[PDB]
């Protein structure tokens, strides 16, 4: 299947 | 606030 | 001082 | 599916 | 303030 | 049979 | 008011 | 059947 | 105000 | 026997 | 005299 | 005797 | 609707 | 969506 | 025999 | 046999 | 609405 | 002795 | 007067 | 997902 | 009869 | 790391 | 020798 | 006598 | 359907 | 698939 | 004798 | 003896 | 349909 | 003396 | 599969 | 009589 | 692992 | 010797 990787996500 | 989807892969 | 992410492949 | 906003006022 | 109508919506 | 689909009516 | 039928199939 | 308004006067 | 008159109606 | 249909009839 | 959807005389 | 063969029918 | 015969084989 | 239709297939 | 989607509609 | 329809008015 | 008239049919 | 066939009459 | 299949006056 | 046969010797 | 020889298959 | 894919080797 | 995927040697 | 030989008939 | 004699021998 | 007839064989 | 193969469809 | 149909109308 | 008329047959 | 039929229509 | 006759001598 | 002398048949 | 096909050998 | 349809030696 497909593959990802995300670092990191912040939201403020 | 953001609205929708995040990733390395998106599959919508 | 943000920072989103870091990726090591 | 479907991503969005619906409504008869929609500010954003 | 702002006035809005939505009649409707469909998605198939 | 039919097959009918309405999103929404708004009488205002 | 308003009158008569309202739906996503009307068979009258 | 029959849909609507009768009447001798009809305000509508 | 207005005067209307209806002598009937036939629905068959 | 005979079909006869009238309305309707408005004396003024 | 006479009225009516259907009228015998 | 007679052979014959038939898929299918679609009626709308 | 349809009217008739349907199959495979049809002897009228 | 997509709207399809398929009578029917023989396979011999 | 046959191989492989047989459908209306065939999403692959 | 005979197949079809038949009448004074014939409204298909 | 139409009006049609028939007398009659004979099948032999 | 004799055969005989009528569909019908309308009479109006 | 007569009316049918078979009319034998 | 995949769809078929898979071997060393295939025969249909 | 017939010799055939497949080494691997990767579906990913 | 890496990522490597080898389907298959045959060796006769 | 080495075989697969991925050889590192 | 006479000798005579018929190996088959197809009909269809 | 058919009419008519099969034999190895016919004698007629 | 293949459709073949033969009607008859005679071997004396 | 006779020998090899007799059909109205022969495959080999 | 005599082998066949017979009559005022025949439908073979 | 057909209309036929044998008068006779004799067969000796 | 053999007659097969008559037909009389 | 094959199809005749095998052997040193071979009368037919 | 005849004098004959085949070694081997190999089929595959 | 060669692969290798030999009939026969007739030593007389 | 040897006879066969494969001989290793």
Do not use: E
Given at each position: ?12
């Amino acid at each position: 299947g497909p593959l990802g990787m995300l670092g990191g996500v912040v939201i403020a």
